Design a protein around this nucleic acid. Structure first.
Ligand SMILES: Nc1ncnc2c1ncn2[C@@H]1O[C@H](COP(=O)(O)OP(=O)(O)O)[C@@H](O)[C@H]1O
Ligand SMILES: Nc1ncnc2c1ncn2[C@@H]1O[C@H](COP(=O)(O)OP(=O)(O)O)[C@@H](O)[C@H]1O
Ligand SMILES: Nc1ncnc2c1ncn2[C@@H]1O[C@H](COP(=O)(O)OP(=O)(O)O)[C@@H](O)[C@H]1O
Ligand code: BEF
Ligand code: BEF
Ligand code: BEF
Ligand SMILES: [Mg+2]
Ligand SMILES: [Mg+2]
Ligand SMILES: [Mg+2]
Ligand SMILES: [Zn+2]
Ligand SMILES: [Zn+2]
Lengths: 185, 343, 363, 248, 373, 366
DNA sequence: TTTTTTTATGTACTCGTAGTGTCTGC
DNA sequence: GCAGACACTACGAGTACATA
């Protein structure tokens, strides 16, 4: 039914694919979780990758003509297709019937997909604490107190960072046990 | 080192803790429930953080990390629950335990859990150094004859009424498998909160899931009870021990019994059992066993047994396990076989 | 042509509520009484045999523990979460096929979701089907999760061979044992199933199907699919008669009963059945020998076994006492000689034929 | 261990032996029933020290001229000895002194001489294995072909990494399938002229060959679908490879 | 035309339409009725002895399911999908040689790939051949998928000894037992094969091949090819008889009749004739034992003789009528002891001679006379 | 360092041509008809007792399948492919020591590379020797490749016995039963081999070697090589008679007549004398069985004795006259059972003594 | 209260470890 | 560069099971 049209370049497609398919390694329980969700909405590409715990969504501008739709592609195969193609080459994509065909002029691949309805998404919620923190400040917050985490601990909550906020300041608690760390930016 | 029973270990738990605790003895479930009671008592007391460590050779001591360094956010004391190997530890682990005790903090508790240890393992450096303040306690599952009283006492503790027929069917179906017994008691309590169970559905909620070590098998075969022996063999299904153990067992007691019958003309059977102290709970159960036999009866038994001995090991028969059903049943109502088999 | 795909009766008639579970009164009533009140152990182990309802009952607990109404022994009828569990998709129940997930590199990750917040509805609850395939270290991870389970989560568990689990996890889990269905239960359930859709049925076919099911309900449903197929949309006595060549079992006793006399066509019919069935001739003659030996045992003891062939305690006894012991010894000699020389016959069927002919040659 | 006769001395930089082994190592048998098939054949000619490795379905032969007179001698060295010898190669400045014997291979590198036992067998005649007619010959860019084959192979069948060339006039079409059917098609502009032809063959092997030689412009030679393909670089003829087709 | 390629009778003559099967009724009818009524069960196991058709029946059913038109019990031989499965390597039929796929590391991958939709036809047919070879972990992995597979996946399991499977797998899927074929069916199939092959044939040779096939059609076809090779491209009673080692030469009834008539000279003459013929002695003894067995069976009931043995039926009936059962049993036991002692005899001819002599001299009605006292 | 290493006759004289093979007329005719007529098959298994030639027939068939002349019934012997197969270098003849390479791992490995085209030959012959020692998983792994292999690959199986194979594999190959070779074929082949090898030989010695081999070229030829070491350069009757332990003297029938008359002392004295002289016991009981057979045969039909029997008729006919027909068969059965139990006896002489005492226990009155 | 006592050979599976390709923001 | 990540692949061991 749905038939999407990609017309993109490698340099503007390699990095979003890396950021969306990095954590997607290994074998997930639902086979769709091992798959990468492609959505073509307006002049926008949405690449979604999940592990039932975290979702990475990359947005890519579509300057060249396109067609809206939604499908899912084996992440490793699609990434290896986009990788290795000649630098500056244009990837065109048409999802016909069951299979998705990618083309780079002199190359053509036909990849098997899975219906987009099967892909899980995280329900909307209310964001209590919304802020626009400077990126460098968040980087400092993470790095100055991330070396102490106590990964793989019996507490089953000592394994994660804590974030506390008050007024115009915030702190990151490095729950570790024999180690503690805090950062006040 | 005190070497007491958990019925007193509860008393030492109620009083001031006597440093490290070592509860031992092969247990179906009593070890785990004693551990749970220790956990709840400690939670009521100071020690709350139960770190589980599996004592095993070729496994390094990550406990030293807890031993050398104290907890920083919530000290609250803590308890090291050690799981011993089923054969006991080695000298290296035994001495590293002493090193750990040398690293012991005042808020640290040592709990060592396992089965019975060898004398050298029992008298290792760590146990010897801990003999001044630590305690030792051991327990074991009740026997067949001791089961009904234990089951009734547990029922009275759990505030549910039982019956003689219910206890009989429980001790038959769940003989020595206390985990299954406890689950069945809970199931009967939850199924009917009436509190009155005589024989309405106790069989309906109880299956045949019990352990059966071979030593009792001859205890039936010596009476020659066809239905009882057949039912015992059917109970042995689904936990089926390989035939060689059962075969070794009955060849042991039949060689002993044939020697006894040979010597019966000599020094009497009691003073003969004085040599044969096989602790068959009196050495008198064998005394009433030897009452019902004949020399030709022993011949008919030994012929079949020795024919099976080559029937499973010379040519690797597949029915040989079921052959244990064949040999035990035919002896029940065979005063003496008029040859025709003489294997 | 490509329409009307009647999927398996094993999957279509899968129970939806505790009122649709045939048999197993003890488990059903126990969990019904346990769900009204809050005493819920953190792990429920289900065990039984092939195709009874362990998986179905586990689906029912996922139905019950998670509902808009709450923890209810009574069903829900329709409510979102339990509605969602009628089909495969559901957020706060994850069904780990433990057979496909045996290594820790998978099960540790799966259990690592226990410390995340539960999805829509309380009681993050997952069903680790066929637990007996977890690796040892996988069992250690499961034990470390069970000893300190998060209060907001629970998780069921299922298997078929409970003896393979470690004693620690078995002792921890509140095991329910699920019994094999009786013949009457399966027969009535199959009657109901056949009446439900459209298929006519005669009773003898259904007793035959129940007997051949060996107690598993899923087995009865597979055989009723085959019976419908062979019978052309009608489970009559003829398709199940074609199945009768497979479910016909009592053969070794009839030949023993017919050996002591000349019954005519009985021996020929029985040898034809044995040849067309192709069972082990050596085992057939060994069963013959065992029956004859216990008969000789009964001759010298009026009730020597008693529990032998309770269904044939009114015919086997006649030949157990009427036949002279000398004839029994001679027959034992004949059958022993036949077995000793059986492998060297041109064919083992010919050998057993010759044993039968020698037995019939004398008396 | 004592010294040996039939011991010809070699004087060659470690880079030479490294290039040779790296040229014919990926096609050396690993735990195969043909016992002589393991290891490499070192054969001495007045022109070079030729070396031959084969699995029975990948025949890689390298020929680096040595500049010394060499009596004709054929040797087979097992897999373990070859791997160890390649490990002991480095630097590229020291002259390696290779000493051959009847049952042993010794080698002096720097200040250390190491030895390896020698496989007892009669290795096949590689020249007969090489096709006797290069009637259909094509040349194509090495890196272009390598990239195209990697692209095609990323959808190839997992256990049997098998693709299919279709050679038409100045065109190479790579087609690959797999279970869970997926089709990979890629067209390359090549220097070919002759009969239209199709040939199926393993792609891991060809990617390995192209990785080993890595010239500017490769050329392969071939006759018929059943016929094996002989791939070498178009610059020189020092290294040749033979890949046996899939299908039949 | 006759298409002279001479490529293995077995592979050339594998059934391709639903009617070419040798005559398995209880499974072909069930499959056809299921496909006609729309009851396409998602998993079912074919069992039965070697070479009866189960791997062939699975291919026919996959042909029927994935036909271009609507699901038809009798597949067509013209549509693209049927042609492809006919030629093998069909797109949607995944034929898994399970004996080569036993590690769980591959069954897990199979269940990983099962989800993705097929491209052609309706279903994707997983024909897992030799199921009983899968390792235990693979079976347990397959269990959950077999219970509730996706909408478009059918599992064609075929095996030789289904009892090896875990009982739960037997529960998940249907069970079709393919009975070993009768002699008439297999002989008719051989007649069809040779007639279409344009190869002359003799009825006795075909009956011999059917008898020696042990009721499995591939055995008969391999034996037919071996006989075609054995002869000069023609199937002849002489060639088949000499290749099988059977004793159709001078029958065996003469030897047994000389036994019961206690003529040592006739037995010696027949033994010398067989020795000049260069026959193997154990086969002769097996033939004599079989003759005795058939005589006893006919004495119990005259309808025991086979139609393939209708050449000597009158003398068979006469010997059944004359010889008492006890003498038949004594002959059978003596000859069976002789066969047991054949490997330990000083010579096979000499051992068989003494076995014949022992079974003769112990004949009660006409024993060998004591020489003097 | 001799010519390669086959100075032994067992390896030197393996045939290189269908014309050079002895016996096996039916299987050779079948293979030649199949090769010439065009009816070829992908799987032949040759089953027969040891030392009959199934490996040799398989290798010769492999030659014939890959000769440059075409698919020829008789291999060239001189063409390059035949030479390569002789050397073992031929990269398409994949011989398998299946008794040694048993693991299913290697079977799977060799089945993965079946799709490849042959390197040089027409057919990629998978010669498998000692197939019956494949592990059950390996047998079942070979199934789907044996049944429908690609067009270019052909399997050869060479097993000692066929019944150990699963009935699935046994039903997918041509079962060629190699008929065991009779005495005359062995004698003629041995005489021809010795004439080619230029060593003097005596016909009766060759007769002994033939009758003692129990139908095996390899066994008889190994026995001849053993005799060459004993009998210096020649297979002489005396040397092979002493080595093989044949019963040259007449003590066989003497102790036969002692045994049938319940003369225990005489039987024991003869046994002691024979053991002192250095007799072989299995041949003793074989001779016992033969003499008893002759006695019984002339008891039924006179004038049946030949050569030596016809010379010792003066005793044999008297024994047939005095011994009842019933007791002859019992003596024969007892002696053959004793021969069966000779391996299952710690001392061979003690086993023969046991057998003779068992025989004398039929009439143990004195 | 400590008590007797079957193997060879093969096939899988899962957990460490060890060695190696490959390549990424460092 | 580049070393360390990071992956990936192979090998041994310990264990569980099968079959003759
Ligand atoms: N109690 C039951 N009520 C209804 N159907 C049942 C019951 N038990 C088994 N079945 C039938 O058997 C099929 C498989 O049941 P399942 O619960 O998976 O058995 P298992 O205990 O072996 O996992 C179900 O689809 C259902 O049709
Ligand atoms: N029912 C049948 N009809 C026709 N040929 C058959 C039949 N069964 C077996 N065969 C012959 O056997 C050969 C292989 O049969 P196959 O189906 O592989 O048996 P299996 O069930 O053992 O795999 C076929 O090529 C065919 O010639
Ligand atoms: N039919 C035969 N023709 C000629 N020589 C034979 C024959 N059979 C066996 N031999 C001899 O026996 C030796 C071993 O033969 P071989 O074929 O290995 O027997 P096997 O079948 O037992 O492996 C050969 O080298 C050859 O000398
Ligand atoms: F799914 Be059940 F345990 F057969
Ligand atoms: F040859 Be069949 F698949 F047993
Ligand atoms: F049977 Be042979 F010695 F291979
Ligand atoms: Mg289940
Ligand atoms: Mg098959
Ligand atoms: Mg051989
Ligand atoms: Zn609900
Ligand atoms: Zn069609």
């Amino acid at each position: 039914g749905p038939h999407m049209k990609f017309t993109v370049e490698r340099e503007h497609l390699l990095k979003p694919l890396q950021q969306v398919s990095g954590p997607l390694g290994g074998r997930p329980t639902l086979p769709i979780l091992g798959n990468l969700l492609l959505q073509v909405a307006d002049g926008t590409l949405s690449l979604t990758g999940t592990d039932l715990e975290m979702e990475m969504v990359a947005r890519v501008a579509l300057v060249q003509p396109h067609e809206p739709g939604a499908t899912t592609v084996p992440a490793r195969k699609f990434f290896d297709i986009c990788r290795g193609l000649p630098e500056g080459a244009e990837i065109a994509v048409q999802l016909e019937g069951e299979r998705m065909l990618v083309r780079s002029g002199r190359s053509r691949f036909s990849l098997s997909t899975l219906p987009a309805a099967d892909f899980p998404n995280l329900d909307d919620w209310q964001s209590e604490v919304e802020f626009t923190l400077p990126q460098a400040t968040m980087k400092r917050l993470i790095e100055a107190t991330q070396f102490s985490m106590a990964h793989q601990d019996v507490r089953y909550y000592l394994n994660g960072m804590l974030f506390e906020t008050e007024g115009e300041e915030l702190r990151t608690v490095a729950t570790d046990g024999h180690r503690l760390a805090v950062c006040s930016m | 080192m005190i070497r007491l029973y958990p019925e007193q270990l509860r008393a030492q738990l109620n009083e001031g803790l006597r440093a490290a605790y070592l509860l031992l003895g092969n247990d179906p479930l009593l070890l785990q429930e004693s551990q749970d009671a220790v956990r709840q008592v400690a939670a009521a007391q100071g020690f709350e953080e139960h770190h589980t460590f599996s004592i095993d050779p070729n496994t390094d001591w990550n406990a030293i990390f807890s031993l050398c360094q104290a907890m920083s956010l919530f000290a609250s004391r803590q308890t090291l629950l050690l799981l011993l190997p089923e054969n006991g530890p080695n000298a290296a682990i035994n001495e590293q335990l002493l090193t750990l005790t040398g690293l012991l903090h005042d808020d640290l508790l040592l709990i060592v859990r396992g089965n019975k240890l060898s004398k050298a393992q029992e008298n290792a450096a760590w146990f010897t150094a801990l003999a001044n303040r630590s305690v030792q306690v051991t327990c074991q599952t009740p026997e067949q004859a001791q089961l009904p009283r234990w089951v009734a006492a547990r029922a009275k503790q759990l505030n549910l009424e039982l019956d003689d027929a219910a206890n009989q069917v429980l001790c038959y179906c769940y003989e020595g498998n206390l985990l299954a017994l406890a689950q069945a008691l809970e199931r009967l309590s939850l199924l009917w909160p009436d509190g009155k169970l005589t024989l309405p559905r106790v069989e309906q909620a109880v299956n045949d899931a019990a352990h059966f070590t071979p030593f009792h098998w001859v205890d039936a075969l010596l009476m020659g009870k066809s239905k009882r022996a057949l039912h015992i063999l059917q109970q042995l299904r689904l936990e089926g021990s390989e035939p060689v153990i059962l075969l070794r067992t009955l060849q042991r007691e039949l060689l002993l019994l044939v020697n006894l019958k040979r010597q019966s003309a000599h020094t009497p059977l009691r003073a003969l059992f004085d040599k044969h102290r096989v602790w068959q709970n009196r050495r008198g159960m064998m005394g009433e066993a030897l009452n019902r036999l004949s020399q030709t009866q022993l011949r008919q038994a030994v012929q079949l047994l020795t024919r099976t001995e080559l029937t499973l090991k010379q040519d690797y028969g597949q029915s040989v396990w079921a052959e244990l059903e064949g040999l035990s049943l035919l002896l029940c109502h065979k005063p003496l076989a008029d040859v025709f088999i003489d294997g | 042509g490509p329409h009307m795909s009647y999927q398996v009766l094993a999957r279509k008639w899968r129970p939806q509520t505790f009122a649709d579970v045939v048999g197993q009164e003890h488990v059903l009533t126990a969990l019904a009484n346990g769900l009204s009140l809050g005493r819920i152990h953190h792990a429920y182990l289900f065990s039984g045999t092939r195709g009874v309802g362990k998986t179905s009952i586990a689906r029912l607990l996922a139905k019950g523990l998670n509902c808009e109404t709450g923890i209810t022994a009574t069903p829900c009828g329709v409510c979102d979460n339990c509605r969602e569990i009628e089909q495969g998709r559901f957020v706060d129940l994850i069904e780990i096929d433990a057979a496909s997930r045996t290594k820790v590199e998978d099960t540790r990750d799966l259990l690592d979701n226990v410390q995340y917040a539960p999805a829509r509805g309380r009681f993050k609850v997952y069903l680790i089907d066929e637990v007996h395939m977890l690796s040892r270290h996988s069992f250690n991870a499961l034990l470390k999760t069970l000893e300190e389970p998060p209060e907001h989560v629970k998780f069921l568990l299922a298997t078929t061979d409970p003896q393979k689990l470690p004693v620690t996890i078995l002792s921890r889990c509140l095991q329910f044992h699920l019994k094999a269905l009786d013949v009457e239960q399966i027969r009535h359930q199959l009657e109901h199933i056949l009446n439900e859709e459209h298929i006519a049925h005669e009773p003898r076919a259904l007793q035959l199907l129940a007997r051949a099911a060996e107690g598993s309900l899923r087995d009865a449903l597979s055989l009723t699919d085959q019976a419908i197929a062979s019978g052309d949309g009608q489970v009559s006595t003829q398709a199940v008669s074609a199945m009768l060549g497979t479910l016909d079992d009592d053969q070794a006793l009839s030949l023993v009963e017919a050996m002591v006399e000349a019954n005519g066509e009985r021996v020929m019919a029985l040898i034809n059945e044995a040849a067309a069935r192709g069972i082990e001739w050596e085992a057939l003659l060994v069963e013959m020998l065992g029956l004859l030996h216990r008969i000789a045992m009964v001759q010298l003891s009026p009730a020597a076994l008693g529990n032998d062939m309770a269904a044939i305690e009114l015919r086997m006894r006649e030949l157990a006492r009427t036949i002279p012991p000398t004839d029994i010894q001679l027959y034992y000699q004949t059958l022993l000689i036949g077995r000793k020389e059986l492998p060297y016959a041109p064919d083992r069927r010919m050998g057993v034929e010759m044993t039968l002919l020698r037995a019939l040659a004398f008396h | 261990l004592d010294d040996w006769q039939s011991e010809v001395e070699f004087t060659l930089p470690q880079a030479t032996m490294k290039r040779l082994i790296e040229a014919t190592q990926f096609s050396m048998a690993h735990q195969d029933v043909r016992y002589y098939l393991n290891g490499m054949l070192f054969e001495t000619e007045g022109e070079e020290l030729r070396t031959v490795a084969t699995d029975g379905h990948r025949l890689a032969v390298c020929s680096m001229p040595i500049g010394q007179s060499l009596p004709s001698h054929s040797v087979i060295v097992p897999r373990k000895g070859v791997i160890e010898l390649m490990r002991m190669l480095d630097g590229g400045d020291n002259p390696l002194r290779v000493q051959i014997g009847s049952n042993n291979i010794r080698a002096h590198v720097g200040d250390f001489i190491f030895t390896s036992k020698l496989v007892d067998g009669r290795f096949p005649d590689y020249r007969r294995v090489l096709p006797k007619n290069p009637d259909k010959h094509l040349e194509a860019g090495c890196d272009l072909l390598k990239q195209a084959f990697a692209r095609a192979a990323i959808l190839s069948n997992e256990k049997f990494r098998g693709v299919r060339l279709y050679v038409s006039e100045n065109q190479l079409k790579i087609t690959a399938n797999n279970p869970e059917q997926e089709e990979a098609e890629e067209i390359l502009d090549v220097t070919y002229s002759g009969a239209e032809m199709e040939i199926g063959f393993n792609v891991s092997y060809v990617l390995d060959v192209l990785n080993a030689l890595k010239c500017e412009n490769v050329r392969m030679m071939l006759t018929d679908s059943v016929s094996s393909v002989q791939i070498e670089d178009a610059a020189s003829q020092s290294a040749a490879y033979v890949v046996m087709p899939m299908r039949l």
